[PDB]
């Protein structure tokens, strides 16, 4: 697998209208917010799952493009598949003693499964396949302005089993963010790609997934989510020639002249990108 | 703490060649760890007097040395800082012009068993002991110069 | 008692205001599954200046629903609100951790007082 | 071990007692004197003959039993059992 | 019989009452040797009379008295068990010899416990956490019966404070109230999320005890989330926990920015007392 | 390898944004904090590990630049390698009797391993290899302002083993610091470098590692970490010309007057560097 | 009083093959978050007269005390430094006032604006009183 030969950094801008970009499991289902400033948050795992879903949809389980975590599968069975394909006994809870075979099993896992090859995975279980760090990493998405989550009451004209009034025989709850423009940062590391085999075709498919991430993620509670801007910084050498924080500071978001009241559309924000350093090429056509 | 004392060198051979003299505290058996169980927040009052020795000067008089000691104690002067046994335990000292303050063991008669009285340097550094009984919190050792306590 | 109506500390007053708003909503709309403290506590303590205005709108609606009935407490809660917001020059954009703790202390102090028979 | 330097000479006794930690003795049929050192090493003497023993190796303790007289071995059955569990 | 003797001497009675053969005037010697490579050193030595040292041991056990957390626990905790609970991984080794010397010393002399004791147990509470991998059926408590007993003994002796043997709802003491509040928040959490891997006892106990002002807001908000979920789901009356929070927060005027070591010990004792009085209330 | 001839003290300022700079093994995996004050901590060991990782990445195991504490290495085997290279028979617990042989083995280990040469090591294992102190030392890193770690609850759509738990998805949680600016102090000793061989090229590589420490350390828990400032004080003689605590006080970090509320970006802080004594100079260009 | 903290750490590599059969070790590291220590010392001129301890030696001793820790850096000690060094120089070959009464003049307390546990030298305010007539006072730091 001819791994990529350049270090990348990208910034993704997406917004939600009357939707719930990511619920909070331990606080009802409210959208995640910063507990001190109120800015909305979307966990990296959510975006990674959306990318996984897009890859699965657009590849339909083709060769070398399977997905490891998938949906209600048993991972130990996947590890057993990997061991069988390598002619090894998975009986021990440890990795095979011979380093060559311990590398062979993990290489098979990386080659077969796209999300392992891209984001990495931990496979230390009863049947062990090692660890992969993942060439592609992305941090939490954070709204540019504070959001005010809204709880919407909804009723139902039907009952599941039996009601006590046999009146609000059913009352539900819907959480929505009236609007919020989120900014997601991400990094791609060439050495890790060389270790796992993350190639250029994988990078192109990843860009496609980022651009069309939400077009097939529609749901009753998602609302209208869309990808607005994707700026990709490509370094001229393997290790890069500019700090990450310097590049991300080139992408700036501001209200422009629509300061009247709360933001309610992408037209209320203005995005500008500066000139990249000498050794970095910035492509924004995505 | 350290295992052994530093040995006597011969200075002459010290630079018959460049001879680096040193003691490696951390090297092997040189490092000896010694646990100490020690007292805390002590307080004593010492009653002592004087005695002229054979090599006393023709003009030396007990009164003169007594007054010198009293002046030094009153002013806090000292040849060296006194310590409670070991040098890392300095002693704060005063002269008691008034009465000795009341003791904590005022109503006790505690037996402390035999304990060192002094070391007789005339009879080849021979230690001599006495049965120490703490009556009323005050210990009255026998005179260490007497002949019936010395062998 | 424990409640101190003379504190006049902005976090404390905001906590008291939140407690009285929750009590007003509970009285106006009995049987609701979730109260204000269950819904807007996170947002209220995060950025009070962004959500307290709508909390006050809802409280006004709730007091309106109570004043109509001949049993009129509504007026009592409204006067409490007048007094509490009287001592506030402006809502805080953000509240520090200790300030949030004081906010919760004030909320719990006010809530117990309104539960007195 | 200094027994190799001085072998069965009496001066081994002097050296050991000069460097040895607490010394023990046995009075069981044949007189025995024990000189113990740090490092769990013990030197045992009787007349000119002597035997060196290590308290961490079983074989040394067995040999110490073998080097002793029969009646002494019976009295040292308790002590021998004590060292032998060192493992 | 030994149990009867311990009960008697703890209560302040004389051992002669349980059995008459003791002549308490006979004087008793206790010696403690600590080893090193090849030579062993004396660590402590007491020569008090049988009656006096028996009375001192009884006073020690009286000070250690606490309501046991589980029925299987010893009524009179062993000194080794108490010391072991301060060890790095609750095993006999890793016990600091100095603390042991200050125990089986302060125990049988009646003097103050070594000042190092309280920070040791507090640090263990900071470092310890739930250990379901222990194969013990009950998720191990961070503030066990033995640690609470040690803290109570230290506070009673070295600080002269008053500490009850069980929960005191009239204490109205700020550290004690904060400990009780932490206990009720924890109960709300483990009711809202059954079978949770870890509770707030694992992480926020240290900072809550040491710096209440900077961490109690998040604990209260999380407990609000827990009760809100607990209200929609079965057990709709959450109401009891809210009432308890009201009744405890009522006696507090401000969350302290910081607390002293003895105040932290009081916090731990209050948390232990409230937790025990909440296992099967409902 | 001529050693350096100047004492150095340096101050490093690095950030963390929605990340976990250093987990606490005792408190689950929460970021290390000072419980009595709330300030965050990052063990010097973590920074040394990151420096080792960067050195290994940028030197790819070149000669005289191997790293001793590797991912899966066995230290006794490395010590055996050293003894074989020195042509000696290793006693189990003891160094070679001939002090020159012990010096030779220790010097070999220092020369052919970078991190032994820099940070020192303890090698008194079942195949003894001596000890080294290490010219370069660094203390804990402590946040300028108290941090507010928050628990992020996440889920997974798959189950490792055979289980009927999922009627809800498998649970899990991350711990993140919304933002924290950390200050790390460090020292370099010429007298120790003389004994160990720490050269000037090693110093340049060390500065590079400090500057680019985090650029290749991305992961699913780190978030966005970056090094913001690096002030280096260089003395003109092997023994310094001023106490270190005087120098560290010249670097004053305080919140910008134009900022209010919780800190969320490095722009919220203003860093000022004072005038150094006459015997010292400040390399505020990193 | 100080309250040392226990810090848990890990290591990548295992030392022996026996423990390699999961290949990590969990050590621990004890630290004092902060603590200000006071060290007393006595120099006896009569003893020096029997040894040759001269004034240049005294200057070197003051320098060492001032710069003891500047070369003692290590993984365990963290940051340690000398803050104040007060020297009482007696006029007489013997003393001129009790040492314990001189050490009392150096009073160290907590600054007005500091509360909670101390975490920096700024939390402590140190003052030195007026020494008796027969002794001088110096402040090397």
From Swiss-Prot, chain D:
* UniProt entry tagged with the keyword Endoplasmic reticulum: no
| UniProt keywords, alphabetically | CRISPR-cas system evasion by virus, Host-virus interaction, Inhibition of host adaptive immune response by virus, Viral immunoevasion
GO biological process: what's one of them? symbiont-mediated suppression of host CRISPR-cas system
Q: Does the keyword ATP-binding apply?
A: no
Summarizing the function annotation, the protein's role is: Allows the phage to evade the CRISPR/Cas system type I-F.
UniProt protein name:
Anti-CRISPR protein 30
Organism (species): Pseudomonas phage D3112 (Bacteriophage D3112)
Query: Mind giving the lineage of the organism this protein is from?
Result: Viruses, Duplodnaviria, Heunggongvirae, Uroviricota, Caudoviricetes
